Design an enzyme around this catalytic site. Sequence first.
Site, PDB file in Angstrom:
ATOM      1  N   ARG C  36       0.802  -1.227   0.000  1.00 10.11           N
ATOM      2  CA  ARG C  36       0.000   0.000   0.000  1.00 10.11           C
ATOM      3  C   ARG C  36       0.839   1.283   0.000  1.00 10.11           C
ATOM      4  O   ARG C  36       1.956   1.300   0.512  1.00 10.11           O
ATOM      5  CB  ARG C  36      -0.931   0.001   1.217  1.00 10.11           C
ATOM      6  CG  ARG C  36      -2.075  -0.998   1.119  1.00 10.11           C
ATOM      7  CD  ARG C  36      -2.864  -1.069   2.422  1.00 10.11           C
ATOM      8  N   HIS C  95       8.147   0.985   3.851  1.00  9.89           N
ATOM      9  CA  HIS C  95       7.809  -0.396   4.135  1.00  9.89           C
ATOM     10  C   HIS C  95       9.097  -1.182   4.372  1.00  9.89           C
ATOM     11  O   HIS C  95      10.188  -0.761   3.964  1.00  9.89           O
ATOM     12  CB  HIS C  95       7.033  -1.029   2.983  1.00  9.89           C
ATOM     13  CG  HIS C  95       5.626  -0.545   2.857  1.00  9.89           C
ATOM     14  ND1 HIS C  95       4.697  -0.684   3.866  1.00  9.89           N
ATOM     15  CD2 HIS C  95       4.979   0.050   1.827  1.00  9.89           C
ATOM     16  CE1 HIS C  95       3.539  -0.188   3.463  1.00  9.89           C
ATOM     17  NE2 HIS C  95       3.686   0.268   2.231  1.00  9.89           N
TER      18      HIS C  95
HETATM   19  C1  LIG Z   1       4.424  -3.169   7.147  1.00 12.77           C
HETATM   20  C2  LIG Z   1       5.096  -1.846   6.968  1.00 12.77           C
HETATM   21  O1  LIG Z   1       6.246  -1.802   6.557  1.00 12.77           O
HETATM   22  C3  LIG Z   1       4.332  -0.586   7.298  1.00 12.77           C
HETATM   23  C4  LIG Z   1       5.283   0.422   7.917  1.00 12.77           C
HETATM   24  C5  LIG Z   1       4.703   1.791   7.704  1.00 12.77           C
HETATM   25  O2  LIG Z   1       3.908   2.096   6.830  1.00 12.77           O
HETATM   26  O3  LIG Z   1       5.175   2.675   8.602  1.00 12.77           O
HETATM   27  N1  LIG Z   1       3.305  -0.956   8.254  1.00 12.77           N
HETATM   28  C6  LIG Z   1       1.975  -0.949   7.900  1.00 12.77           C
HETATM   29  O4  LIG Z   1       1.538  -0.596   6.811  1.00 12.77           O
HETATM   30  C7  LIG Z   1       1.102  -1.434   9.026  1.00 12.77           C
HETATM   31  C8  LIG Z   1       1.083  -2.928   8.988  1.00 12.77           C
HETATM   32  C9  LIG Z   1       0.054  -3.659   8.544  1.00 12.77           C
HETATM   33  C10 LIG Z   1       0.135  -5.153   8.577  1.00 12.77           C
HETATM   34  C11 LIG Z   1       0.167  -5.885   7.252  1.00 12.77           C
HETATM   35  C12 LIG Z   1       0.430  -7.356   7.524  1.00 12.77           C
HETATM   36  C13 LIG Z   1       0.429  -8.153   6.237  1.00 12.77           C
HETATM   37  C14 LIG Z   1       1.446  -7.596   5.262  1.00 12.77           C
HETATM   38  C15 LIG Z   1       1.183  -6.122   4.998  1.00 12.77           C
HETATM   39  C16 LIG Z   1       1.220  -5.348   6.300  1.00 12.77           C
HETATM   40  C17 LIG Z   1      -1.201  -3.015   8.045  1.00 12.77           C
HETATM   41  N2  LIG Z   1      -0.965  -1.605   7.804  1.00 12.77           N
HETATM   42  C18 LIG Z   1      -1.958  -0.752   7.374  1.00 12.77           C
HETATM   43  O5  LIG Z   1      -2.884  -1.017   6.618  1.00 12.77           O
HETATM   44  N3  LIG Z   1      -1.694   0.454   7.972  1.00 12.77           N
HETATM   45  C19 LIG Z   1      -2.197   1.718   7.478  1.00 12.77           C
HETATM   46  C20 LIG Z   1      -3.502   2.079   8.160  1.00 12.77           C
HETATM   47  N4  LIG Z   1      -3.323   2.341   9.572  1.00 12.77           N
HETATM   48  C21 LIG Z   1      -4.419   2.508  10.398  1.00 12.77           C
HETATM   49  O6  LIG Z   1      -5.587   2.334  10.071  1.00 12.77           O
HETATM   50  C22 LIG Z   1      -4.093   2.946  11.767  1.00 12.77           C
HETATM   51  C23 LIG Z   1      -2.897   2.552  12.325  1.00 12.77           C
HETATM   52  C24 LIG Z   1      -2.518   2.924  13.598  1.00 12.77           C
HETATM   53  C25 LIG Z   1      -3.430   3.717  14.256  1.00 12.77           C
HETATM   54  N5  LIG Z   1      -3.398   4.267  15.505  1.00 12.77           N
HETATM   55  C26 LIG Z   1      -4.550   4.973  15.686  1.00 12.77           C
HETATM   56  N6  LIG Z   1      -5.315   4.901  14.619  1.00 12.77           N
HETATM   57  C27 LIG Z   1      -4.634   4.123  13.720  1.00 12.77           C
HETATM   58  C28 LIG Z   1      -5.000   3.742  12.436  1.00 12.77           C
HETATM   59  C29 LIG Z   1      -0.598   0.374   8.793  1.00 12.77           C
HETATM   60  O7  LIG Z   1      -0.008   1.299   9.331  1.00 12.77           O
HETATM   61  N7  LIG Z   1      -0.249  -0.954   8.796  1.00 12.77           N
END
Ligand SMILES: *CC(=O)[C@H](CC(=O)O)NC(=O)[C@@H]1C=C(CC2CCCCC2)Cn2c(=O)n(CCNC(=O)c3ccc4[nH]cnc4c3)c(=O)n21
EC number: 3.4.22.61
Lengths: 90, 90, 152, 152
Positions: C36, C95
Amino acid sequence: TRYIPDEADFLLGMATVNNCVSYRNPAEGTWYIQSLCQSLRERCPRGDDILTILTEVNYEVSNKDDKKNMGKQMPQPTFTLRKKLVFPSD
Amino acid sequence: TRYIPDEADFLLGMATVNNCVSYRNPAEGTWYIQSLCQSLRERCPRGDDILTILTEVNYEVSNKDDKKNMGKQMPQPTFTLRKKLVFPSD
Amino acid sequence: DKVYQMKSKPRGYCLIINNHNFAKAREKVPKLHSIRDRNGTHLDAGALTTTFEELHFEIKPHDDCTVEQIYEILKIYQLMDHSNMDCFICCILSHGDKGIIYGTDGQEAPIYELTSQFTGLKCPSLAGKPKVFFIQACQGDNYQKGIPVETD
Amino acid sequence: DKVYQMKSKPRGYCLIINNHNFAKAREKVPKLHSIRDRNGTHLDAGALTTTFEELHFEIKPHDDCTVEQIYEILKIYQLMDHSNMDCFICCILSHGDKGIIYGTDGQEAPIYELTSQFTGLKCPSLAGKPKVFFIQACQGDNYQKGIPVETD
Ligand SMILES: *CC(=O)[C@H](CC(=O)O)NC(=O)[C@@H]1C=C(CC2CCCCC2)Cn2c(=O)n(CCNC(=O)c3ccc4[nH]cnc4c3)c(=O)n21
Ligand SMILES: *CC(=O)[C@H](CC(=O)O)NC(=O)[C@@H]1C=C(CC2CCCCC2)Cn2c(=O)n(CCNC(=O)c3ccc4[nH]cnc4c3)c(=O)n21
């Protein structure tokens, strides 16, 4: 003259331990970087060193949770620093 | 109740960075462990925390050398500690 | 207690590699078909900029870098004269997976391949000076589990 | 500043795995034909014992352990009740290579496989408490190079 190791004086601040995810709130920024910046801005003026600050980041990020997946995040510093590291604000 | 990460509250003290050798003086012990013990015995009574002590170990071991191979040794702590770690002597 | 000298103005460079757009990865790397775009990453870049400017660092931002572009940027700073600096900071927002970060193109850069460009031998004008790397990325796909503890 | 509670007497167990005799490795593992006995390692074991007894830990020494024996020892401590302890320390004195330590038999134990036995889920009576591992071993065969700096 004096010699020290080639790989001395590094600090590596990882958002997470190996094998695991770290989190990004699209409306606020990442748990790790946002916590890091908050702690730096509050503590650097007080003369606190970076390992103390990064310990606080560990504490703060450890209290956050992902209520969708019942997930946590554990940041993890690693260092070959040989002295205290402070970032004076003055 | 409160939840923290599964892998929280670890301290890993490595004698060396990855890919490299660490040294053992057969008549004295290892550079790393002997330095660690000396620093713990001197600094724990003063209330110093373990990251400060391990920074001193980095400093001390960094000044040692292997005059046969022109080698150095760089120890390297890694941590998920969320609080200061002290070992009180009392 | 010994403390690193930290008096120069500026203190040093603070590089920020800020990767948002992973279209190339999605098109090019089969296994990253659904990787993403990192929406909101600019908020981290801004926070780091505010914070480290306040602490007297010269900020050097780079958005949307492939692995080759990241290595080019680090090579530029490796060859630069840091003699009048007391510190070097490099922030990577991307990522990642075990031991690596992803370029926007979905290629992998081992974290050691980034940090090891600034060893004493490769960047002598930083010899004896703190080199600080902040890596915001996943290091795998596992959700770290929680454990119950008493409240402080 | 928050500080881990460190008031219990004893503070906790301090395990010492002290590997000297690598005869088994030399006979059994082709590539370790010339791996050496770790002469003087008892001086480290003794220093650690003196130091951590002074700091109120209960010392648990184990000499000349194979990988299977190391895992057995850690399993014993993983299943033990640490509820009245404030800390756990494990010291490993052995040969090693990248990311691993060697048993006396020349088998490999990944460092993560040792530390991960004491996570919150696997050892709940250490949940919220410091778990400290000291690893004295090589992590490869390269001689770290030196760099010239100004004397402090
Ligand atoms: C995996 C990575 O390298 C990234 C690092 C980054 O972007 O800083 N992490 C994510 O993208 C993180 C991890 C996941 C897990 C997946 C497992 C299967 C393989 C792909 C990764 C999902 N993902 C994601 O969709 N988001 C973006 C949306 N975040 C939220 O909705 C959100 C996060 C934290 C939070 N705190 C309060 N409100 C929220 C909302 C992620 O960040 N991750
Ligand atoms: C490689 C390891 O895992 C061990 C760790 C240990 O025993 O704590 N390290 C050594 O054994 C260390 C490393 C080498 C390099 C070799 C590279 C090729 C592959 C095999 C390892 C050599 N080795 C060794 O022979 N000794 C024992 C003798 N030490 C000394 O003579 C000595 C060391 C330090 C010192 N300071 C002051 N005087 C001395 C004397 C090693 O410790 N190493």
